[PDB]
mmCIF file of C-alpha atoms in Angstrom:
data_model
loop_
_atom_site.group_PDB
_atom_site.id
_atom_site.type_symbol
_atom_site.label_atom_id
_atom_site.label_comp_id
_atom_site.label_asym_id
_atom_site.label_seq_id
_atom_site.Cartn_x
_atom_site.Cartn_y
_atom_site.Cartn_z
ATOM 1 C CA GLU A 1 149.431 63.198 139.524
ATOM 2 C CA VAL A 2 151.911 66.122 139.907
ATOM 3 C CA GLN A 3 150.109 69.480 139.319
ATOM 4 C CA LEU A 4 151.760 72.972 139.051
ATOM 5 C CA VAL A 5 149.552 76.074 138.611
ATOM 6 C CA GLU A 6 151.058 79.610 138.118
ATOM 7 C CA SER A 7 149.085 82.758 139.073
ATOM 8 C CA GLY A 8 149.636 86.467 139.686
ATOM 9 C CA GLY A 9 150.688 87.226 136.105
ATOM 10 C CA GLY A 10 149.416 90.034 133.875
ATOM 11 C CA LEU A 11 150.143 93.755 133.252
ATOM 12 C CA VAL A 12 153.073 95.630 135.008
ATOM 13 C CA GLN A 13 154.317 99.216 134.467
ATOM 14 C CA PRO A 14 158.009 99.642 133.411
ATOM 15 C CA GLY A 15 160.076 99.869 136.628
ATOM 16 C CA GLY A 16 157.185 98.258 138.567
ATOM 17 C CA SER A 17 156.973 95.083 140.660
ATOM 18 C CA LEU A 18 154.861 91.867 140.704
ATOM 19 C CA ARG A 19 154.695 88.646 142.712
ATOM 20 C CA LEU A 20 153.968 85.266 141.055
ATOM 21 C CA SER A 21 152.735 82.176 142.927
ATOM 22 C CA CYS A 22 152.872 78.488 141.954
ATOM 23 C CA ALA A 23 150.292 76.404 143.906
ATOM 24 C CA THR A 24 151.002 72.635 143.803
ATOM 25 C CA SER A 25 149.339 69.200 144.371
ATOM 26 C CA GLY A 26 150.128 65.464 144.033
ATOM 27 C CA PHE A 27 153.472 65.459 145.866
ATOM 28 C CA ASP A 28 155.348 66.308 149.044
ATOM 29 C CA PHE A 29 156.548 69.819 148.013
ATOM 30 C CA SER A 30 158.717 70.137 151.219
ATOM 31 C CA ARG A 31 161.029 67.289 149.915
ATOM 32 C CA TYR A 32 161.775 68.857 146.489
ATOM 33 C CA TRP A 33 163.920 71.637 145.036
ATOM 34 C CA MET A 34 161.674 74.019 142.966
ATOM 35 C CA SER A 35 162.606 76.227 139.926
ATOM 36 C CA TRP A 36 161.528 79.062 137.647
ATOM 37 C CA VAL A 37 162.073 79.191 133.834
ATOM 38 C CA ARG A 38 160.965 82.010 131.507
ATOM 39 C CA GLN A 39 160.377 82.376 127.738
ATOM 40 C CA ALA A 40 159.893 85.663 125.844
ATOM 41 C CA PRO A 41 157.347 85.527 122.894
ATOM 42 C CA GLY A 42 158.750 83.458 120.000
ATOM 43 C CA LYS A 43 162.092 83.051 121.863
ATOM 44 C CA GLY A 44 163.938 80.255 123.736
ATOM 45 C CA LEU A 45 163.930 79.036 127.365
ATOM 46 C CA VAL A 46 165.883 80.964 130.073
ATOM 47 C CA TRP A 47 166.638 79.502 133.548
ATOM 48 C CA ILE A 48 165.807 82.008 136.328
ATOM 49 C CA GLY A 49 166.908 80.062 139.368
ATOM 50 C CA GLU A 50 166.121 77.441 142.007
ATOM 51 C CA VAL A 51 165.370 77.011 145.763
ATOM 52 C CA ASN A 52 166.150 73.953 147.967
ATOM 53 C CA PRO A 53 163.565 72.458 150.485
ATOM 54 C CA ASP A 54 164.762 74.312 153.659
ATOM 55 C CA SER A 55 165.500 77.598 151.675
ATOM 56 C CA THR A 56 169.292 77.538 152.573
ATOM 57 C CA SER A 57 170.373 77.330 148.880
ATOM 58 C CA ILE A 58 168.903 79.913 146.453
ATOM 59 C CA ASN A 59 170.700 80.012 143.058
ATOM 60 C CA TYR A 60 170.155 82.459 140.134
ATOM 61 C CA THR A 61 171.422 83.263 136.611
ATOM 62 C CA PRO A 62 173.949 86.097 137.477
ATOM 63 C CA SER A 63 172.451 88.530 134.884
ATOM 64 C CA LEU A 64 168.938 88.185 136.526
ATOM 65 C CA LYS A 65 169.867 88.257 140.310
ATOM 66 C CA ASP A 66 168.820 91.969 140.651
ATOM 67 C CA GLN A 67 165.349 91.625 138.990
ATOM 68 C CA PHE A 68 164.274 88.407 140.876
ATOM 69 C CA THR A 69 163.864 86.976 144.430
ATOM 70 C CA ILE A 70 162.787 83.305 144.769
ATOM 71 C CA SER A 71 161.082 82.034 148.006
ATOM 72 C CA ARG A 72 158.692 79.202 149.115
ATOM 73 C CA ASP A 73 156.122 78.333 151.824
ATOM 74 C CA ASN A 74 156.230 74.582 152.577
ATOM 75 C CA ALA A 75 153.076 74.749 154.828
ATOM 76 C CA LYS A 76 151.025 76.085 151.840
ATOM 77 C CA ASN A 77 152.978 73.928 149.222
ATOM 78 C CA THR A 78 153.556 77.163 147.238
ATOM 79 C CA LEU A 79 156.557 78.527 145.288
ATOM 80 C CA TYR A 80 156.952 82.334 144.834
ATOM 81 C CA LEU A 81 158.642 84.718 142.350
ATOM 82 C CA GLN A 82 159.157 88.368 143.391
ATOM 83 C CA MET A 83 159.859 90.473 140.266
ATOM 84 C CA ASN A 84 161.428 93.908 140.765
ATOM 85 C CA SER A 85 162.091 97.031 138.538
ATOM 86 C CA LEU A 86 160.716 95.270 135.402
ATOM 87 C CA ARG A 87 161.926 96.113 131.886
ATOM 88 C CA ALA A 88 160.364 95.437 128.423
ATOM 89 C CA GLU A 89 163.060 92.679 128.055
ATOM 90 C CA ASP A 90 161.317 90.864 131.020
ATOM 91 C CA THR A 91 158.005 90.382 129.080
ATOM 92 C CA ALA A 92 157.690 86.546 129.078
ATOM 93 C CA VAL A 93 155.743 83.423 130.039
ATOM 94 C CA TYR A 94 156.947 82.386 133.526
ATOM 95 C CA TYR A 95 157.027 78.589 134.196
ATOM 96 C CA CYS A 96 157.073 76.930 137.585
ATOM 97 C CA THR A 97 159.136 73.638 137.348
ATOM 98 C CA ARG A 98 160.011 70.659 139.581
ATOM 99 C CA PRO A 99 163.704 69.599 139.663
ATOM 100 C CA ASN A 100 164.107 65.774 139.844
ATOM 101 C CA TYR A 101 166.679 62.920 139.180
ATOM 102 C CA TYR A 102 169.095 67.365 137.804
ATOM 103 C CA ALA A 103 166.322 67.483 135.111
ATOM 104 C CA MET A 104 162.921 69.308 135.278
ATOM 105 C CA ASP A 105 160.295 66.498 135.163
ATOM 106 C CA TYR A 106 157.120 68.627 135.578
ATOM 107 C CA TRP A 107 156.249 72.093 134.242
ATOM 108 C CA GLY A 108 153.194 74.293 134.862
ATOM 109 C CA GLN A 109 151.196 75.837 131.967
ATOM 110 C CA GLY A 110 152.998 79.155 132.718
ATOM 111 C CA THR A 111 151.802 82.734 133.292
ATOM 112 C CA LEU A 112 152.396 85.615 130.829
ATOM 113 C CA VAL A 113 153.740 88.892 132.328
ATOM 114 C CA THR A 114 153.391 91.997 130.051
ATOM 115 C CA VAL A 115 155.598 95.065 130.791
ATOM 116 C CA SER A 116 153.796 98.171 129.389
ATOM 117 C CA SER A 117 152.483 101.664 130.283
ATOM 118 C CA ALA A 118 149.040 100.874 128.653
ATOM 119 C CA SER A 119 145.858 99.858 130.623
ATOM 120 C CA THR A 120 143.877 96.576 131.130
ATOM 121 C CA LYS A 121 140.663 96.037 129.078
ATOM 122 C CA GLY A 122 138.153 93.158 129.124
ATOM 123 C CA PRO A 123 136.993 91.662 125.782
ATOM 124 C CA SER A 124 133.608 91.332 124.000
ATOM 125 C CA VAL A 125 132.534 87.822 122.827
ATOM 126 C CA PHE A 126 130.300 87.356 119.733
ATOM 127 C CA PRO A 127 129.170 84.084 118.051
ATOM 128 C CA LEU A 128 130.199 82.880 114.551
ATOM 129 C CA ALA A 129 126.958 80.957 113.730
ATOM 130 C CA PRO A 130 126.966 77.843 111.489
ATOM 131 C CA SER A 131 124.947 78.206 108.242
ATOM 132 C CA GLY A 132 128.646 66.796 105.785
ATOM 133 C CA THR A 133 130.879 69.206 107.799
ATOM 134 C CA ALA A 134 129.868 72.564 109.417
ATOM 135 C CA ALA A 135 132.015 75.396 110.904
ATOM 136 C CA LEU A 136 131.189 77.539 113.985
ATOM 137 C CA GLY A 137 133.115 79.684 116.458
ATOM 138 C CA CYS A 138 133.611 82.745 118.677
ATOM 139 C CA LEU A 139 134.992 86.198 118.003
ATOM 140 C CA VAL A 140 136.837 87.599 121.095
ATOM 141 C CA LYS A 141 137.295 91.357 120.391
ATOM 142 C CA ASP A 142 139.057 94.413 121.950
ATOM 143 C CA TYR A 143 141.195 93.283 124.953
ATOM 144 C CA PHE A 144 144.568 94.146 126.586
ATOM 145 C CA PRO A 145 147.099 92.740 127.502
ATOM 146 C CA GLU A 146 147.430 89.144 126.214
ATOM 147 C CA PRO A 147 146.394 86.267 126.748
ATOM 148 C CA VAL A 148 142.814 84.955 126.359
ATOM 149 C CA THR A 149 142.210 81.183 126.630
ATOM 150 C CA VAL A 150 139.324 79.529 124.763
ATOM 151 C CA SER A 151 137.788 76.111 125.450
ATOM 152 C CA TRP A 152 134.628 74.465 123.988
ATOM 153 C CA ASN A 153 131.818 72.835 126.112
ATOM 154 C CA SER A 154 134.053 73.194 129.260
ATOM 155 C CA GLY A 155 136.870 71.181 127.571
ATOM 156 C CA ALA A 156 134.628 68.287 126.389
ATOM 157 C CA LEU A 157 134.954 69.308 122.672
ATOM 158 C CA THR A 158 138.625 69.380 121.437
ATOM 159 C CA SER A 159 138.676 67.693 117.934
ATOM 160 C CA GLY A 160 138.612 70.101 114.981
ATOM 161 C CA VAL A 161 139.297 73.137 117.252
ATOM 162 C CA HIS A 162 141.562 75.959 115.914
ATOM 163 C CA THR A 163 142.208 79.013 118.164
ATOM 164 C CA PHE A 164 144.013 81.600 116.100
ATOM 165 C CA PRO A 165 146.964 83.694 117.438
ATOM 166 C CA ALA A 166 145.782 87.177 118.579
ATOM 167 C CA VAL A 167 146.131 90.122 116.142
ATOM 168 C CA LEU A 168 146.991 93.628 117.414
ATOM 169 C CA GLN A 169 144.476 96.134 115.961
ATOM 170 C CA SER A 170 145.035 99.851 115.045
ATOM 171 C CA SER A 171 143.325 100.799 118.398
ATOM 172 C CA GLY A 172 146.082 99.005 120.387
ATOM 173 C CA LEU A 173 143.703 96.218 121.474
ATOM 174 C CA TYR A 174 143.994 92.510 120.695
ATOM 175 C CA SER A 175 141.389 90.414 118.925
ATOM 176 C CA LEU A 176 141.164 86.726 118.022
ATOM 177 C CA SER A 177 138.767 84.037 116.855
ATOM 178 C CA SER A 178 138.409 80.374 117.895
ATOM 179 C CA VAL A 179 136.666 77.960 115.435
ATOM 180 C CA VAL A 180 135.489 74.309 115.314
ATOM 181 C CA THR A 181 134.260 71.990 112.526
ATOM 182 C CA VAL A 182 131.484 69.599 113.604
ATOM 183 C CA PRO A 183 128.996 67.133 111.926
ATOM 184 C CA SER A 184 126.361 69.229 110.066
ATOM 185 C CA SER A 185 123.625 66.766 111.329
ATOM 186 C CA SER A 186 124.437 67.696 114.993
ATOM 187 C CA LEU A 187 123.701 71.487 114.442
ATOM 188 C CA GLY A 188 120.050 71.155 115.543
ATOM 189 C CA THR A 189 120.693 68.557 118.285
ATOM 190 C CA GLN A 190 124.050 69.359 120.044
ATOM 191 C CA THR A 191 124.742 72.505 122.109
ATOM 192 C CA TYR A 192 128.009 74.460 121.423
ATOM 193 C CA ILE A 193 129.424 76.944 123.982
ATOM 194 C CA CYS A 194 132.794 78.809 123.867
ATOM 195 C CA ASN A 195 134.419 79.426 127.275
ATOM 196 C CA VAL A 196 136.468 82.667 127.102
ATOM 197 C CA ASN A 197 138.873 83.651 129.934
ATOM 198 C CA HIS A 198 140.840 86.928 130.162
ATOM 199 C CA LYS A 199 142.644 86.617 133.556
ATOM 200 C CA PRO A 200 144.298 90.162 133.463
ATOM 201 C CA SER A 201 140.830 91.786 133.579
ATOM 202 C CA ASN A 202 139.272 88.719 135.399
ATOM 203 C CA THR A 203 136.622 88.371 132.573
ATOM 204 C CA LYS A 204 134.878 84.966 132.204
ATOM 205 C CA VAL A 205 132.276 84.567 129.397
ATOM 206 C CA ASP A 206 130.375 81.410 128.269
ATOM 207 C CA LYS A 207 128.856 82.114 124.815
ATOM 208 C CA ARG A 208 126.207 79.775 123.361
ATOM 209 C CA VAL A 209 126.718 79.435 119.582
ATOM 210 C CA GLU A 210 123.485 78.292 117.836
ATOM 211 C CA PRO A 211 122.501 78.184 114.086
ATOM 212 C CA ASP B 1 178.076 80.102 132.133
ATOM 213 C CA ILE B 2 178.214 77.001 129.826
ATOM 214 C CA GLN B 3 177.187 77.752 126.226
ATOM 215 C CA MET B 4 174.829 75.189 124.687
ATOM 216 C CA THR B 5 174.708 75.148 120.825
ATOM 217 C CA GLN B 6 172.102 73.255 118.765
ATOM 218 C CA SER B 7 172.337 72.179 115.075
ATOM 219 C CA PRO B 8 170.350 72.400 112.835
ATOM 220 C CA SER B 9 168.372 75.446 114.136
ATOM 221 C CA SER B 10 165.414 74.381 111.880
ATOM 222 C CA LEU B 11 164.496 71.331 109.684
ATOM 223 C CA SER B 12 161.600 69.935 107.545
ATOM 224 C CA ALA B 13 161.086 66.156 107.178
ATOM 225 C CA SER B 14 158.405 63.625 106.116
ATOM 226 C CA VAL B 15 156.388 61.118 108.222
ATOM 227 C CA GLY B 16 158.521 57.913 108.450
ATOM 228 C CA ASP B 17 161.911 59.740 108.186
ATOM 229 C CA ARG B 18 164.765 59.269 110.683
ATOM 230 C CA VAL B 19 165.642 62.655 112.325
ATOM 231 C CA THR B 20 168.881 63.528 114.200
ATOM 232 C CA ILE B 21 169.534 66.781 116.172
ATOM 233 C CA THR B 22 172.930 67.726 117.671
ATOM 234 C CA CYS B 23 173.741 69.576 120.916
ATOM 235 C CA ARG B 24 177.278 70.974 121.656
ATOM 236 C CA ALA B 25 178.503 72.104 125.125
ATOM 237 C CA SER B 26 181.261 74.840 125.410
ATOM 238 C CA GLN B 27 183.045 72.538 128.004
ATOM 239 C CA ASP B 28 182.858 68.879 129.286
ATOM 240 C CA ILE B 29 179.448 68.285 131.045
ATOM 241 C CA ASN B 30 179.870 64.435 131.414
ATOM 242 C CA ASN B 31 176.368 62.853 130.937
ATOM 243 C CA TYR B 32 174.393 65.739 132.663
ATOM 244 C CA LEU B 33 172.444 66.642 129.488
ATOM 245 C CA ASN B 34 168.602 66.695 129.124
ATOM 246 C CA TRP B 35 166.191 67.073 126.157
ATOM 247 C CA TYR B 36 162.780 68.897 126.243
ATOM 248 C CA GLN B 37 159.942 68.960 123.697
ATOM 249 C CA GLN B 38 157.710 72.059 123.224
ATOM 250 C CA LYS B 39 154.620 71.493 121.005
ATOM 251 C CA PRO B 40 152.896 74.660 119.574
ATOM 252 C CA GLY B 41 151.184 76.739 122.294
ATOM 253 C CA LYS B 42 152.091 74.131 124.983
ATOM 254 C CA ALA B 43 154.458 74.126 128.003
ATOM 255 C CA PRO B 44 157.847 72.211 127.577
ATOM 256 C CA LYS B 45 157.931 68.494 128.480
ATOM 257 C CA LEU B 46 160.889 66.328 129.583
ATOM 258 C CA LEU B 47 161.781 63.624 127.002
ATOM 259 C CA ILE B 48 165.306 62.471 127.906
ATOM 260 C CA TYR B 49 167.433 62.922 131.094
ATOM 261 C CA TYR B 50 171.085 61.928 131.822
ATOM 262 C CA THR B 51 171.935 61.858 128.024
ATOM 263 C CA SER B 52 169.874 58.684 127.223
ATOM 264 C CA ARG B 53 167.287 57.826 129.936
ATOM 265 C CA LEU B 54 163.669 58.029 128.713
ATOM 266 C CA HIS B 55 161.182 59.832 130.974
ATOM 267 C CA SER B 56 157.916 57.897 131.798
ATOM 268 C CA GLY B 57 155.271 57.801 129.028
ATOM 269 C CA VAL B 58 157.686 59.244 126.391
ATOM 270 C CA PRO B 59 157.446 57.483 122.903
ATOM 271 C CA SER B 60 159.978 54.649 122.369
ATOM 272 C CA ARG B 61 160.940 56.173 118.950
ATOM 273 C CA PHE B 62 162.913 58.915 120.858
ATOM 274 C CA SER B 63 166.511 58.415 122.025
ATOM 275 C CA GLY B 64 169.618 60.285 123.178
ATOM 276 C CA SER B 65 173.395 59.648 122.973
ATOM 277 C CA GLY B 66 176.818 61.284 123.458
ATOM 278 C CA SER B 67 179.271 62.315 126.217
ATOM 279 C CA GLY B 68 181.575 65.208 127.174
ATOM 280 C CA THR B 69 180.897 68.052 124.740
ATOM 281 C CA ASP B 70 178.915 66.352 121.889
ATOM 282 C CA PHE B 71 175.355 64.953 122.127
ATOM 283 C CA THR B 72 172.659 63.657 119.763
ATOM 284 C CA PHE B 73 168.796 63.459 119.963
ATOM 285 C CA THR B 74 167.108 60.915 117.528
ATOM 286 C CA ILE B 75 163.526 60.278 116.260
ATOM 287 C CA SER B 76 163.718 56.770 114.679
ATOM 288 C CA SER B 77 160.467 57.312 112.668
ATOM 289 C CA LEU B 78 158.917 60.807 112.395
ATOM 290 C CA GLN B 79 155.148 61.073 113.203
ATOM 291 C CA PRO B 80 152.740 64.080 112.734
ATOM 292 C CA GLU B 81 152.532 64.562 116.580
ATOM 293 C CA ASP B 82 156.340 65.353 116.617
ATOM 294 C CA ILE B 83 155.784 68.914 115.218
ATOM 295 C CA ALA B 84 157.640 70.967 117.925
ATOM 296 C CA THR B 85 160.752 72.837 119.148
ATOM 297 C CA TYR B 86 163.371 70.644 120.888
ATOM 298 C CA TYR B 87 165.746 72.003 123.535
ATOM 299 C CA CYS B 88 168.899 70.556 125.051
ATOM 300 C CA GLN B 89 169.857 71.554 128.665
ATOM 301 C CA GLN B 90 173.046 71.118 130.719
ATOM 302 C CA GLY B 91 172.744 70.217 134.427
ATOM 303 C CA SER B 92 176.494 70.094 135.136
ATOM 304 C CA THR B 93 177.317 73.605 136.448
ATOM 305 C CA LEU B 94 175.355 76.604 137.773
ATOM 306 C CA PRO B 95 173.679 78.508 136.185
ATOM 307 C CA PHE B 96 171.883 75.748 134.269
ATOM 308 C CA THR B 97 171.644 76.713 130.597
ATOM 309 C CA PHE B 98 169.588 75.767 127.550
ATOM 310 C CA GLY B 99 170.363 75.312 123.847
ATOM 311 C CA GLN B 100 168.632 77.845 121.543
ATOM 312 C CA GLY B 101 166.215 75.157 120.236
ATOM 313 C CA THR B 102 165.574 73.190 117.041
ATOM 314 C CA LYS B 103 162.261 73.804 115.220
ATOM 315 C CA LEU B 104 160.966 70.602 113.595
ATOM 316 C CA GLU B 105 158.510 71.048 110.657
ATOM 317 C CA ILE B 106 156.587 68.387 108.655
ATOM 318 C CA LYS B 107 156.636 68.160 104.844
ATOM 319 C CA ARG B 108 153.367 66.525 103.469
ATOM 320 C CA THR B 109 151.138 66.351 100.310
ATOM 321 C CA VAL B 110 149.071 69.286 98.923
ATOM 322 C CA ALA B 111 145.692 69.739 100.705
ATOM 323 C CA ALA B 112 142.990 72.219 99.559
ATOM 324 C CA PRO B 113 141.328 74.463 102.192
ATOM 325 C CA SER B 114 137.665 74.055 103.153
ATOM 326 C CA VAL B 115 136.287 77.638 102.894
ATOM 327 C CA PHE B 116 133.628 79.137 105.259
ATOM 328 C CA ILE B 117 132.111 82.693 105.551
ATOM 329 C CA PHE B 118 130.575 84.175 108.752
ATOM 330 C CA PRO B 119 128.271 87.257 108.733
ATOM 331 C CA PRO B 120 128.377 89.620 111.794
ATOM 332 C CA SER B 121 126.111 88.525 114.692
ATOM 333 C CA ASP B 122 122.862 90.396 115.578
ATOM 334 C CA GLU B 123 124.446 91.106 119.028
ATOM 335 C CA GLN B 124 127.568 92.900 117.561
ATOM 336 C CA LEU B 125 125.426 95.069 115.217
ATOM 337 C CA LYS B 126 123.745 96.551 118.416
ATOM 338 C CA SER B 127 127.129 98.081 119.394
ATOM 339 C CA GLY B 128 127.223 99.695 115.890
ATOM 340 C CA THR B 129 130.058 97.468 114.536
ATOM 341 C CA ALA B 130 130.194 94.678 111.870
ATOM 342 C CA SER B 131 132.946 91.983 111.673
ATOM 343 C CA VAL B 132 132.882 89.513 108.722
ATOM 344 C CA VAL B 133 135.047 86.365 109.150
ATOM 345 C CA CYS B 134 136.457 84.171 106.314
ATOM 346 C CA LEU B 135 137.838 80.715 107.368
ATOM 347 C CA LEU B 136 140.349 78.607 105.335
ATOM 348 C CA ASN B 137 140.451 75.252 107.156
ATOM 349 C CA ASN B 138 143.215 72.550 107.071
ATOM 350 C CA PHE B 139 145.387 73.390 104.014
ATOM 351 C CA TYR B 140 148.958 72.548 102.873
ATOM 352 C CA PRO B 141 151.296 74.368 102.052
ATOM 353 C CA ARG B 142 151.017 77.593 104.169
ATOM 354 C CA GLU B 143 150.875 79.946 101.129
ATOM 355 C CA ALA B 144 147.315 81.188 100.533
ATOM 356 C CA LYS B 145 145.651 84.344 99.100
ATOM 357 C CA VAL B 146 142.339 85.881 100.328
ATOM 358 C CA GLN B 147 140.516 88.799 98.576
ATOM 359 C CA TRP B 148 137.395 90.519 100.000
ATOM 360 C CA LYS B 149 134.635 91.538 97.568
ATOM 361 C CA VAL B 150 131.717 93.819 98.575
ATOM 362 C CA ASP B 151 129.042 94.042 95.791
ATOM 363 C CA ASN B 152 131.681 92.511 93.392
ATOM 364 C CA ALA B 153 134.033 95.459 94.248
ATOM 365 C CA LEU B 154 137.460 94.665 95.802
ATOM 366 C CA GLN B 155 138.214 95.880 99.364
ATOM 367 C CA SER B 156 141.404 97.974 99.696
ATOM 368 C CA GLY B 157 141.482 97.949 103.523
ATOM 369 C CA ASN B 158 140.094 97.132 107.025
ATOM 370 C CA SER B 159 140.952 93.355 106.979
ATOM 371 C CA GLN B 160 143.416 91.313 109.131
ATOM 372 C CA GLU B 161 144.776 87.750 108.780
ATOM 373 C CA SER B 162 145.792 85.219 111.403
ATOM 374 C CA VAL B 163 147.448 81.774 110.725
ATOM 375 C CA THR B 164 147.791 78.748 113.050
ATOM 376 C CA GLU B 165 150.955 76.596 113.491
ATOM 377 C CA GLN B 166 151.099 73.069 111.891
ATOM 378 C CA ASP B 167 148.388 70.767 113.302
ATOM 379 C CA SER B 168 149.669 67.818 115.437
ATOM 380 C CA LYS B 169 147.428 65.222 113.644
ATOM 381 C CA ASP B 170 147.419 66.154 109.894
ATOM 382 C CA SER B 171 150.350 68.804 109.617
ATOM 383 C CA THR B 172 147.923 71.357 108.077
ATOM 384 C CA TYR B 173 147.475 75.110 108.571
ATOM 385 C CA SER B 174 144.297 77.097 109.103
ATOM 386 C CA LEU B 175 143.775 80.807 108.351
ATOM 387 C CA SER B 176 141.197 83.452 109.329
ATOM 388 C CA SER B 177 140.613 86.813 107.561
ATOM 389 C CA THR B 178 138.503 89.397 109.389
ATOM 390 C CA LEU B 179 136.907 92.357 107.622
ATOM 391 C CA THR B 180 135.729 95.137 110.024
ATOM 392 C CA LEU B 181 133.179 97.816 109.039
ATOM 393 C CA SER B 182 130.892 100.243 110.918
ATOM 394 C CA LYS B 183 127.149 99.221 110.915
ATOM 395 C CA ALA B 184 126.475 102.255 108.603
ATOM 396 C CA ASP B 185 128.988 101.089 105.908
ATOM 397 C CA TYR B 186 127.833 97.448 106.366
ATOM 398 C CA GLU B 187 124.152 98.402 105.700
ATOM 399 C CA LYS B 188 125.157 100.202 102.436
ATOM 400 C CA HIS B 189 125.861 96.891 100.591
ATOM 401 C CA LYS B 190 124.198 93.496 99.885
ATOM 402 C CA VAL B 191 126.754 90.849 98.710
ATOM 403 C CA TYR B 192 129.747 89.992 100.951
ATOM 404 C CA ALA B 193 132.256 87.506 99.490
ATOM 405 C CA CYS B 194 135.743 86.133 100.247
ATOM 406 C CA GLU B 195 137.787 84.757 97.291
ATOM 407 C CA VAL B 196 140.472 82.109 98.048
ATOM 408 C CA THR B 197 143.584 81.166 95.958
ATOM 409 C CA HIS B 198 145.658 78.060 96.897
ATOM 410 C CA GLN B 199 147.846 75.448 95.089
ATOM 411 C CA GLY B 200 145.287 72.689 95.909
ATOM 412 C CA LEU B 201 142.500 74.607 94.123
ATOM 413 C CA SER B 202 142.239 74.288 90.279
ATOM 414 C CA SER B 203 140.594 77.773 90.163
ATOM 415 C CA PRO B 204 139.753 80.419 92.915
ATOM 416 C CA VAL B 205 136.910 79.449 95.359
ATOM 417 C CA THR B 206 134.333 82.087 96.491
ATOM 418 C CA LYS B 207 132.072 81.842 99.577
ATOM 419 C CA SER B 208 129.367 84.540 99.900
ATOM 420 C CA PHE B 209 126.176 85.727 101.689
ATOM 421 C CA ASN B 210 123.512 88.425 101.209
ATOM 422 C CA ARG B 211 123.152 90.870 104.162
ATOM 423 C CA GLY B 212 119.927 90.061 106.085
ATOM 424 C CA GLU B 213 119.662 86.418 104.872
#
């Protein structure tokens, strides 16, 4: 099926620059128009612009034409987004989309870009041990910027999972917890592991959570 | 640039209800109007294109109508998995523009939280810090009170709350409260308790542990 994966996100200094990439699979990229859409935290969707297959037509939202440059590499089936002189108002999740019919029929999971003068920090992962239904989880503490993604047993366990929105501590670092309710009879038999990923610091932790 | 206006901005409805959302274009856009769904913490998904054409795999209970400047999006029978923000988008003139979105919430029956307490791990205590987590699982409505008690004495600081969005299967909320102390302060006391107040509870529920057990 159609796959769209955004990368190159993360922390950027005010006035700084960053380049985003959208790697694709499942279709002949060279035959489609490709687009970028952004969304600031808790806000609506904003169209950035589009690029045609042979790169002869590149269209933007007039207010954003100075901060962005869209390009593509058909040989590598990759879409690019060059971001220039970034402001706090540019902090957003950047989505790679595929124009079809137009309408946008496929969207990537998006990549969050954070515009701040602060520095990148990797988190610490601690277990929340279980002690008919039992609760267990993971505490992901002291990281910057957002986001961290949490999965359980490499995505095999999804029912009863709640990953809480991150809370900004007094230190300036984010912290969150991810929890799961499971059968209490499976606590001595089944293995539970939280898979924590903090892409800005490139931190990958697999924590075994045992009673 | 074409201005896209959505109404209502927000709405609450019950499972089984018929829901209608309107989209208004600042000028005539013919039938070049699309509708996207954005479920909590997920990327947007195409539902309807060209005013009324259903995208592949989209539930049959969804439909679109209208022409020119006025359009309508309809859910014939509301289901728990419809908790989301819905966006209309014009594809008539450049730059393509979106509506500001309609947040759809689910009204349901009272549900009491399941309450769980988590002592700090032996690993965290090595770094000289202690985090105590209180979990309020799957409750309705959102309004809930949590009090921390250390040796039956109320805590007047160093706790933080986090709340999830409505669950896609049962329309419930979940809440975490985290109490953070230094290992020194943590080792000064024995009983750690979190007291929970909620509409679904006849009286406050307390979950506790003794440090070391």
